[PDB]
Amino acid sequence: HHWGYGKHNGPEHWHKDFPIAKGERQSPVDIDTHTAKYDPSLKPLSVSYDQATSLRILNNGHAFNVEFDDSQDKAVLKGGPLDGTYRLIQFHFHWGSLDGQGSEHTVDKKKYAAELHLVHWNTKYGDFGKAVQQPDGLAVLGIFLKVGSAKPGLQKVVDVLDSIKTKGKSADFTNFDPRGLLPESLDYWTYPGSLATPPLLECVTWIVLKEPISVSSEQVLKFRKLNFNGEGEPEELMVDNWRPAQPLKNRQIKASFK
């Protein structure tokens, strides 16, 4: 039926409705650190989020998204391997039922407890909808989460989750600053890939940060209390909403560092 992460509609089934799932530039992938090529010509990333305007938080039945005002160049990403300016539209997370799994990308086959995706679209295309149809339309910053110390900047997010427990619920979520979710270092790996949920379009330049951020056990616990289902439906906890690693095929992963 409609796609999800269960036994009957999970990632291994996606190709039936979305044939691009077996495509040549699908994501996520395993990042082999010994085979990644250091590229001296890659520039440092430029993250300008001082003017970010968050608007709302929504449970869409597959994750929760924090949405931003993208009507102007308020929160942008540029530099790195990118040409042009990419506007932040939303961020979401992927997490597991246990601390040993949850991330989409893996590093030398290591899985992290969760993975944050900051989604941005190329302004040359005028809107998000047109950007996903282009090979360089999206830039997604992936940040791994490990369990350790609490991340103060994540607490505002954790605390509103009760209010969007089920699918289709939304809440006003203004004045949230995404700078509170970045690691200290912006060293990264990059490769050409795709959206990791249907429609799985191959329009993403992935930028995966080397340094994970730490969250506490209690923080991640709150994510696992969300529901995949709508209100008044049988309860299905929102856990393990990650797609497994896909074949690298003809692609090279580049590193901004040695």
Binding mask 19-58 for Zn ion (x = CB under 5 A): ----------------------------------------
Is 62 in the active site?
yes
B/e letters for 37-63, b = 16+ CB within 10 Å, e = fewer, are eeeeebeebebbbeebbbbebbbebbb
Alpha-helix residue ranges (DSSP H) falling in 45-154? 128-131
CA 85/CA 46 separation, integer angstroms: 10
3-class secondary structure, 184: coil
Catalytic site residue from 8, 15, 34, 62: 62
Site for Zn ion in 94-133 (CB under 5 A): 117
Could you tell me how many residues make up the chain?
Answer: 258
Q: Which is nearer to Zn ion, 104 or 136 (CB)?
A: 104
Residue nearest to Zn ion (CB): 117
Q: Are 215 and 180 in contact (CB under 8 A)?
A: no
Q: Which is nearer to Zn ion, 87 or 117 (CB)?
A: 117
> At closest approach, how far in Å is the CB of 141 from Zn ion?
11
3-class secondary structure, 232: coil
Site for Zn ion in 175-204 (CB under 5 A): none
**Total residues at interface with Zn ion (CB under 5 A):** 1
Active-site residues, by number, are 62
Q: Which residues bind Zn ion (CB under 5 A)?
A: 117
